[PDB]
Symmetry: C5
C-alpha cells in the first residue's frame, strides 16, 4: 500500500547504500542460534552437518523514520538485497553454507534490523565416541571475515542455544549447546576479531 | 499481442511493485498439495524426499483491470519475477528446495493470482517401520518465514491431499495424506504464525493393508 | 556484418517483448525427440536418466521480415534469451533438467523459430525386468506447464523417436521409442492440456 | 592505464556487438586440445571424465586496430562476456561441462582472438578392457551446435593432442591421442556440420 | 557514513574500471596460504580435497587517496565485484573451486588491496602410501591463467605455509608445507608464466 511504498522509496532510492561499519561508527551485531537437527556425521572425513537458524540483529541511524509521517508503520519486511547485512562466517566450514529460508529481513522504525537465515552447515568435527554414553563435543566459531573488533563487535542475549525446535527423532540427542562471545588473534592480522563460539555436546540417541 | 502488451505495460511499468502485505492490508493465501512421488528415504539420516506440486492462490486490488479496456482479456500468464509471491517455506527442510517447473503464474482480472510450483523437498522424517504393514507417518509444516498471522493467514480448500496423480510404480505407496491449517507459537517471536501441516502416511510397496 | 545488425536491431529494439500466446492469438509448437543414451537406471529409487535433444518449432508474425531489405538474409542465429520460448516441461521429472547445449535458436524470415536443446532428465520409471528379453517400458509426458490447449497446441512430424544418434555401446538397447500427442484434464484447471508422451521400451544390451 | 581504456572503449562501446558469422562472412575456428587427466571411469554407466584445456582461435575485422594509435599496444586481455565466442559443444556429453579456468580471452591487433577454457567433461565411453595391455579407445566430437559448415568451419594446427601436461600419476596412461577435422550429416538437418574428433586410446597404469 | 560514501563514489563512479595490468604497467601479486584441513582423499581417482585461505595482495595507483581529504580514513572494506582482482588459478584442479568466505576485500590509502578468499579445492594427487609413516607428497601450482610474467609477477613473504589454524583432529597430519615462486614455460605459449607452488607432505594421523 501507498504509505509503505513511500517509506521504502524514501529510505532506499534517495541515499546511496550504507557502506558498512567504520572505526568512527562501529556496529554491534547480536547473534543467537536455534538448533534444529544434527543431520549427518561422517567418520571418514570428520565432517558434521547442522541445520539451524541464526538470529542476527543490528541498528543503523540511516534506517530510522517517524511512524506518524508514514501512516503509523512501525516495521516492514524487505529483501535482504535492498540493505547491508553483516558478513558472518563459520570459521571451520568445509562446504558453502546452504540457504534454507527466504532472504528477507525486518526493519523497525528505531533503525533496528533483524535477519534470521535458516542454514545447513558442514564443518570440521571428529565424531569418534558419539556412540558412547559420554558423547562427543564439537565447536564452530561464527564471526565477521573481514571486519576486526574495531568495526564489528558481537554479543549474545543468552549463552544457551535454543533447543525448543530440536527434531525429536534425530539420530543424535543434545547433552549441551552453548553460544559464547570470545576474542581471537590470528597470525595473519594484528587486530582482535570477535566471534561467537557454538559448542555442542551430543551422542547417538539411546 | 497488442492488447496484452498494453495491459502488462499498464500494470507493471506505471507503478512501483507491491511491497507485500501489512497489518492494515493483510492477505490470505490458499495452499493445496498434489503429491507425485516419495522418491527415496534415508534411514541413516532420517531424511525423506518428496516430489509434489503446490497450488498457491491470493488476491490483490493492485492487479485488477476492466477487461473491456483491454480487448476482453480476462487473464494472462506472466513470469513470477514480474510480481510479488508469498515466501512459503518448509519448516523442517534439510536441503534447498529444487524447482521442477517454470516460474510462471496466471493473473485474473479480479486481481487473483494462481502459482503452482512443482518441487522436490528433502525434510526430516524417521522412516523406521516403513517396511511394515502399518507403515510410518511423517509431517512437514509449510508457512511464511517472515510474516506473522497479522500479515499472512493461510487456508486450504480441502484437508484431503490430491493423490490421484501419485506415481503407481513408486517404491512407496501412500495410505493417506492430509493438509491442515494450524497456529504456531515459536520461542523467538511473540506473534502467532500460521502454517499448513502436510501429514503423509506411507509404506514400502508390497500386499495386504 | 551490417545487414544482420540492422535486422536484429529492427526486430528486437523497436518493440516490447512478445508476451506469449493468448486465446485470440494461439500457437502450435512442433516437438520431436532424438534419443542419445539411457545413461543410468536406479532400481532403489525407480529413477531413470535419459540424454536427448528436443527439436522445438513455432511461428510468430512479429519475427517476419523481407529478405531483400536485409541483403538476402533468410535466417539468423540468436540467443534464446532475446526471444520468447515455450515452457515445455517434463511432467514426471525428479530433478531439475540439465542443459547440455548452448541456448541459441534459429529464426527464419517467415517468422518460424527452431530451438533444439540437448538435455539430461531424471524421471520416474521402474526398471525391474530390464535384464530380461522382454525388457521394460517407461513413459514421460512433455507439455506446457501453464498454457492450456486454447493457447498452446502441440504436434509431432512423426510418431517415431529418432534413434540414428543412439550410443552404440550404451548399457541399454532400445526395442521401441515413440512420441504421441495426448489431451487430458487436470483437477486444478477447467481447460484441456496438450502433451507429447515419450514412450521408450528398452533392455540390457545382449 | 589510459591507452588500453581508449582502445577498449573504441572497440566495444561504439558499435553494436558482433552478431556472429553468416553465409556471406563465414568464420574458421582453430581448435586444439591439451589433455591433463583421465580422472574417472564409470563401468556401470559407460561415462568417462576428462580434464583438458581447449585452445580456440578465430579472426574478425571488427577487432583490428593500429598499435601506433594506441601506445604500441599489440594485444590485450578482456572478459569473454565482452565479446562473441564460438558455441563449441561436445556431441556426446552426459553432464554440463565444468569450467575450471577464468573466462578471459586475448585479442591481438590483427583482429585474432584466442580463448583457452579449462574444462571437465563427462562423455559416453565404454571402458571394458581398460585393464588390459591393448586398452580401450574412446571418441568425442567437438563442433558448433547451431552453425553449419556454411557459417563455421573448423581446423586444427596439428592432428596430435598435446600430452606434455598429462598427469604423471594418473590411474590411466595414454597410448595415443589425436584431433581430426571431419564432416558430418545429421538426420535433423540437410547441411554439413564440421567437428573435431578427439580420439584417445588409454589403459590402466 | 558521509566520508566513506564520498571516497567510494570518487574511486568507483568517477573513473572507468581498471582494465588490468599491461607490459608498460605490470603488477606484482603477493600470495600466501593458510592450510586449515586436508578433508578428503580419493585413492580410486587420485583427487585430494584441501580447505585453506589464500592471502592475495597487490597495489594500484588508481586506488590511492589522501586520508586528510576524507576524514582520516586509512582503509575500507568493499565488495570484490567493485574492483579488479587477479585471475589466480590452480593448474591441476579437477573441480571448480568452492568459495567459503564473503567476497569482500580491504583497500588501503596507498592503493594497496588485500583479498583473502577461503576455498575448497579438489586437485590431482596420488594418495597411495598415506597410511605409512613416510606419508605422501603432493603439489599444486597457483598462478594467472591468461597473464604472462610480463604483466603479472608473483611472490611470497615466506616459504613456509601457515599451519597455525590447521585442524588438530584432521584425519591427516602435516609433515611439511611450503609455498615457492617458480617460473613455467608451457608448450602452448613462448613467454614465461609465474606460479606459486604449494607443496604439502602428509600422512594419516
Ligand atoms: N587492515 C588491513 O589492511 C586488512 C584487514 C583485514 C583483512 C582481512 C582479514 C581476513 C582474516 C581475518 C580473520 C582471520 C582470517 C580472515 N578472517 C580476511 N579478509 C580480509 F580482507 C585484510 C586487510
Ligand atoms: N517484529 C519484528 O521486529 C520481527 C518479526 C519477525 C521476524 C522474523 C521471524 C522469523 C521467525 C518466525 C518463524 C519461526 C522462526 C522464523 N520463522 C524469521 N525471520 C524474521 F525476520 C523478525 C523481526
Ligand atoms: N485459469 C486460471 O486461472 C489458471 C490456469 C492455469 C493455471 C496453472 C496450471 C498449472 C497446471 C496445469 C498442468 C497440470 C499441473 C500444472 N500443469 C500450472 N500452473 C498454472 F499457473 C493457473 C490458473
Ligand atoms: N536452417 C535452419 O532453419 C536451422 C538450422 C539449424 C538449426 C539447429 C540445428 C541443431 C542440430 C544440428 C547439429 C546436430 C544436432 C544439433 N547440432 C541445433 N540447434 C539448431 F538451432 C535449426 C534451424
Ligand atoms: N599473446 C597471445 O596471443 C596470447 C597469450 C596468452 C593466451 C592464453 C594462455 C593461456 C595458457 C597459459 C597457461 C598455460 C595454459 C594456459 N594457462 C590461457 N589463456 C590464454 F588466453 C592466449 C594468447
Ligand atoms: C495513525 O495514528 C493517529 C494518531 O493516533 C490516528 O489518529 C490515525 O487514525 C492513525 N492511522 C492513520 C492511517 O493515520
Ligand atoms: C611506440 O614505438 C615507437 C618505436 O619503437 C617508439 O619510438 C614510441 O615512443 C612508442 N610510442 C608510444 C606512444 O609509446
Ligand atoms: O490453432 C491453435 O494453435 C490453437 O487453437 O491452439
Amino acid at each position: 500500500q501507498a504509505n509503505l511504498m513511500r517509506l521504502k522509496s524514501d529510505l532506499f532510492n534517495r541515499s546511496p547504500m550504507y557502506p558498512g561499519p567504520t572505526k568512527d561508527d562501529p556496529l554491534t551485531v547480536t547473534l543467537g542460534f536455534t538448533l534444529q537437527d544434527i543431520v549427518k556425521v561422517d567418520s571418514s572425513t570428520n565432517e558434521v552437518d547442522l541445520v539451524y537458524y541464526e538470529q542476527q540483529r543490528w541498528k543503523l541511524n540511516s534506517l530510522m523514520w517517524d511512524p506518524n509521517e508514514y501512516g503509523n508503520i512501525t516495521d516492514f519486511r524487505t529483501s535482504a538485497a535492498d540493505i547491508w547485512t553483516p558478513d558472518i562466517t563459520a570459521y571451520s566450514s568445509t562446504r558453502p553454507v546452504q540457504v534454507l529460508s527466504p532472504q528477507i529481513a525486518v526493519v523497525t522504525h528505531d533503525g533496528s534490523v533483524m535477519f534470521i537465515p535458516a542454514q545447513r552447515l558442514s564443518f570440521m568435527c571428529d565424531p569418534t565416541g558419539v556412540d558412547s554414553e559420554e558423547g562427543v563435543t564439537c565447536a564452530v566459531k561464527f564471526g565477521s571475515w573481514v571486519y576486526s573488533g574495531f568495526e564489528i563487535d558481537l554479543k549474545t542475549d543468552t549463552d544457551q542455544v535454543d533447543l525448543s525446535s530440536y527434531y525429536a527423532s534425530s539420530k543424535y540427542e543434545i547433552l549441551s549447546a552453548t553460544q559464547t562471545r570470545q576474542v581471537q588473534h590470528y597470525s595473519c592480522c594484528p587486530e582482535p576479531y570477535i566471534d561467537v563460539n557454538l559448542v555442542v555436546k551430543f551422542r547417538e540417541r539411546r
